[PDB]
């Protein structure tokens, strides 16, 4: 995979962005993950993570991965690095995200993830909980 240059044009919420990519604005939906609605129990927490890390960031990337790069709803589905760090993986390892939606081919950094995950689930951090 490759990581592709990308301006932050608004945070959404814990699991979708809005990015400038290739020049044209866009709705990232991220990887492997979900995390809960505004309106429902670390959503709020949640969004809150993900616009401070894309909003504090100096670069964003975007990573496809093998398989569909839209879903049917128009969004890009992508990992997101903010100073190289990676968002998906960020929330998951925070108790604010799980693991879900793995589709086989878009799937290269499921067990990355679930590591997260679980190092999540050990500590009883926010979902968790
Ligand atoms: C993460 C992801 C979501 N989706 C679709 C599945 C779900 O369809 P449905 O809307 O019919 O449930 C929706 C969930 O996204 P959200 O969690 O943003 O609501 O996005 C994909 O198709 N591929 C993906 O990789
Ligand atoms: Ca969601």
New binding site residues.
Partial sequence: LHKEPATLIKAIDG??VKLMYKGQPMTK??????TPEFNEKYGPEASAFTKKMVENAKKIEVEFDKG?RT???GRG?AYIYADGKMVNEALVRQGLAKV??V?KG?NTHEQLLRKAEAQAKKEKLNIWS
Avoid: E, F, G, H
Wanted: a negative charge; charged letters at 30%.
């Fill in positions: 699991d979708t939906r991220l990887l492997l993950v979900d569909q879903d049917k709803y589905l879900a939606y589709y878009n």
